[PDB]
Design a protein around this ligand. Structure first.
Ligand SMILES: CC(=O)N[C@@H]1[C@@H](O[C@@H]2O[C@@H](C)[C@@H](O)[C@@H](O)[C@@H]2O)[C@H](O[C@@H]2O[C@H](CO)[C@H](O)[C@H](O)[C@H]2O)[C@@H](CO)O[C@@H]1O
Length: 449
């Protein structure tokens, strides 16, 4: 029994890491006003999608491999997209669904049908609320809290009444009131109603921002931080790389829009497959989830181009992973014991892993038995026992010379590392720095389609 190392992830954290792909939905007055930020002066009469179909949103997301859907139900403009008891600035005063509309309900019903996990984004900064003022901040905090209770206590909201993530955006306009939030109170309520539900915030919660909206996790990416170095003034590079000395397990979620903007704009186009693939390799392929925003249009529908792109992106990933070229390769090198043997890295069993207490560098060598053509290696740690590896490199034997394939810092939950396409039978993975005796659960090899 190897001892754990460092801060360990919760079950809900590991489940997210396992799921890899989440979808964001920004939709609201901003969609009708052709803007990215609203003022709270938007006319609810203009919130009037011609033919909204949340079931179609959920179906396409499910079919294209997304495992969670995070819905904006109140952006910075403050317009609430479910019939809240706590402000009149909501869908209640919109003509949509002859005034009886509830977008949270509509998305929740569809998500429940498709077993799509649910997140909810409720903007802390509220440009509409007359309570959003330093002189009224206790009242604003009670407003926000009361809405968390409305959202998170209702069996008709979420995936069968369950929410997997709450999103508290850190953004605030320069001229806005400097309201301070009752974070701990909010977190307690979230726990009371939804247990270990993940929380994205500027504070020391289970999810942090990766520090850009480009889909780029750093290398290294430590999925752990010290809460004392977070808050609204957290350094972006700290978010992006995490902390080798972090004290809490923290997922650096990589959010990015399929378009330039978060809301739908007719004049904008979605990213290319090539662009999404790069993002994929620098987010999921660096051990963190990708949260990809798809904005519905003024009809309440996903854009046709955007839909095509999600299917092409899904096809790409299915083809990448179709064959693990490393399965059954003979693996040699040091190993702690038979229970942690090298052959565990390519045996195709999720239940078996490798470890070694040998002095670094530790060299694992795979012999594929015959020459194969590949351009991706996948490594995974056992984060139930903590993140450990700080540096590694990969080589391939070509005409009797061990040439470089690639190098990196961290592995984490899952690390994809691309190299130039090669035909080779023998590969070395060399671990050169680690915070504790290294473990890997798998080595895989693929060819990009
Ligand atoms: C329009 C725009 O680019 N705004 C960004 C801010 O993004 C916010 O978050 C995204 C997801 C979207 O809802 C925007 O309308 C929001 O304004 C950005 O705020 C940071 O956003 C990240 C998430 O990407 C975390 O929530 C941070 O805590 C926020 O500080 C700010 C600063 O990067 O830049 C523009 O205002």
């Amino acid at each position: 029994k190897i001892k754990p190392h460092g801060p360990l992830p919760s079950q809900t954290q590991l489940a997210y890491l396992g799921d890899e792909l989440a979808a964001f939905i920004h939709f609201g007055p901003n969609t009708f006003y052709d803007q990215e930020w609203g003022t709270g002066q938007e006319d609810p009469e203009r919130f009037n999608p011609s033919q909204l179909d949340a079931r179609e949103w959920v179906r396409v997301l499910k079919e294209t491999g997304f495992k969670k859907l995070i819905l904006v139900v109140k952006h910075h403009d403050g317009f609430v997209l479910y019939p809240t008891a706590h402000t009149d600035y909501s869908v209640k005063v919109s003509p949509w669904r002859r005034g009886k509309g509830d977008l949270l309900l509509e998305v929740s019903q569809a998500a429940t049908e498709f077993d799509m996990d649910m997140g909810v984004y409720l903007s802390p900064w509220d440009a509409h609320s007359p309570l959003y003022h330093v002189d009224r901040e206790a009242d604003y905090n009670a407003y926000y809290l009361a809405q968390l209770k409305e959202i998170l206590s209702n069996p008709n909201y979420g995936n069968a009444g369950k929410f997997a993530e709450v999103w508290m955006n850190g953004a605030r306009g320069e001229g806005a009131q400097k309201v301070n939030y009752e974070f701990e109170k909010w977190f307690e309520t979230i726990r009371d109603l939804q247990g270990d539900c993940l929380i994205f915030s500027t504070e020391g919660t289970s999810i942090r921002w990766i520090g850009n909206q480009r889909g780029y996790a750093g290398d290294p990416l430590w999925q752990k931080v010290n809460p004392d170095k977070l808050g609204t003034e957290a350094e972006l590079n700290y978010l992006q790389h995490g902390d080798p000395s972090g004290t809490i397990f923290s997922i650096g979620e990589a959010d990015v829009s399929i378009r330039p903007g978060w809301f739908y704009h007719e004049d904008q186009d979605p990213k290319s497959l090539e662009e999404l693939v790069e993002i994929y390799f620098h987010s999921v392929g660096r051990g963190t989830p990708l949260l990809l925003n798809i904005p519905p249009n003024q009809a309440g529908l996903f854009d046709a181009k955007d839909i095509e792109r999600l299917y092409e992106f899904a096809t790409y990933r299915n083809e990448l992973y179709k064959e693990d070229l490393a399965l059954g390769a003979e693996v040699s090198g040091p190993a702690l014991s038979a229970d942690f043997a090298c052959r565990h890295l390519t045996d195709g069993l999720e239940t078996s892993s490798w470890a070694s207490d040998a002095d670094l560098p530790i060299q694992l060598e795979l012999d594929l038995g015959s020459p194969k053509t590949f351009d991706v290696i996948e490594l995974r740690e056992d984060l139930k026992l903590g993140q450990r590896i700080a540096a590694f490199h990969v080589q391939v034997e070509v005409d009797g010379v061990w040439q470089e394939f690639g190098s990196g810092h961290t592995v984490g939950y899952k690390r994809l590392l691309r190299g130039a396409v090669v035909e080779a039978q023998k590969i070395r993975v060399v671990i050169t720095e680690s915070q504790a005796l290294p473990l890997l659960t798998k080595i895989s090899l693929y060819k990009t389609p």
